[PDB]
């Protein structure tokens, strides 16, 4: 009903005025505990402002969507996540506001567990991939349950932006980080998908590249709960593992998480870059 009148003000170009009226009705509905009506109006308003290129107003209304979700203690549902990712995808990729929105939306989606919901991470990752923001896409894929999407993205990233000396390293880096998040399922899927789909990796396993055999064997050893095998693998593949200074630190964490072996590396590049417990 009121949407009709607000929509007319936006279409006339009275953006400032429509924006403050949306805010007025939002707080009014919220004061009346009409949390749902408040969110629905803000979401439709955000979309309308995005269609006019009015990013600042759209982003503001998007934050009010999250305010309603929070106050009403709404749980994650597929439709809500898809709505939030849609708004994310319309925001300016170079705005601090998108950073703010993502942080607040992931926090809400956690049900403050406190891990961002993996389906929201997935949706974000897919958008970021389409935008060729591979660095951020990768971060979100790692917190998703989507090993297959991650692998396809990393094939594109490695061939587009990586060096030819790194083809095996990109999948090693991803597998080891998935395992540090105790996600052996996605770790196996990213490995299998990447090695099959990457144009510079031939049929295998076994592979010509020692680092790829290491990762293949590691996945088998972890899935089998075989600590003695894990230990042998880490020892015999050290020359390959030294190619990324962080690989032995990831393996320390993996050993701890799956088998209880106390971390071995005295070195901590983690500390330098960000501590492994709180920087994956």
């Amino acid at each position: 009903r009121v949407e009709g009148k607000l929509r007319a003000s936006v279409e006339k170009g009275d953006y400032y005025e429509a924006h403050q009226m949306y805010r007025t009705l939002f707080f009014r509905y919220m004061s009346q505990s009409k949390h749902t009506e408040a969110r629905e109006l803000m979401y439709s308003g955000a979309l309308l402002f995005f269609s006019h290129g009015q990013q600042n107003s759209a982003a503001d209304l998007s934050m009010l969507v999250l305010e309603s979700l929070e106050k009403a203690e709404v749980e994650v549902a597929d439709e809500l996540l898809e709505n939030l990712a849609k708004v994310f995808s319309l925001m300016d990729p170079n705005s601090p506001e998108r950073v703010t929105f993502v942080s607040r939306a992931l926090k809400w989606s956690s049900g403050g567990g406190k891990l961002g919901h993996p389906r929201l991470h997935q949706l974000l990752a897919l958008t970021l991939w389409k935008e060729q923001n591979y660095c951020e896409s990768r971060y979100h894929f790692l917190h998703s349950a989507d090993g297959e999407g991650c692998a396809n993205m990393l094939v594109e990233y490695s061939t587009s932006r990586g060096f030819r000396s790194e083809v095996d390293m990109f999948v090693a880096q991803a597998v080891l980080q998935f395992l540090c998040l105790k996600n052996k399922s996605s770790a196996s899927v990213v490995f299998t998908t990447y090695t099959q789909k990457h144009p510079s990796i031939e049929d295998g396993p076994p592979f010509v590249e020692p680092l790829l055999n290491f990762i293949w064997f590691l996945l088998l050893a972890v899935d089998g709960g075989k600590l003695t095998v894990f230990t042998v693998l880490c020892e015999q593949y050290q020359p390959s593992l030294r190619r990324d200074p962080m690989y032995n630190e990831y393996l320390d964490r993996i050993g701890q998480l799956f088998f209880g072996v106390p971390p071995k590396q005295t070195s901590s590049y983690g500390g330098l870059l960000g501590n492994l417990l709180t920087s994956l």
């Binding site: 591979y134 660095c135 990768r138 990233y157 490695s158 587009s160 932006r161 990586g162 060096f163 000396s165 790194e166 390293m169 990109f170 880096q173 991803a174 980080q177 076994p206 020692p210 055999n213 290491f214 064997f217 003695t228 095998v229 042998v232 693998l233 020892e235 015999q236 593949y237 050290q238 020359p239 390959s240 190619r243 990324d244 962080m246 983690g270 870059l273 960000g274 501590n275 492994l276 709180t278 920087s279 994956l280």
Partner: protein, 42 residues
Amino acid sequence: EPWAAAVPPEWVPIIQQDIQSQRKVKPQPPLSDAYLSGMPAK
């Protein structure tokens, strides 16, 4: 080689070959922005 007793038998020739391959001097070139962007960060 004690390690060979510890792993599945069909892995042994693969690991033997990989041990020998890794003896070869093959310095890693400076790592790309793309690769290093996957490093941990706070």
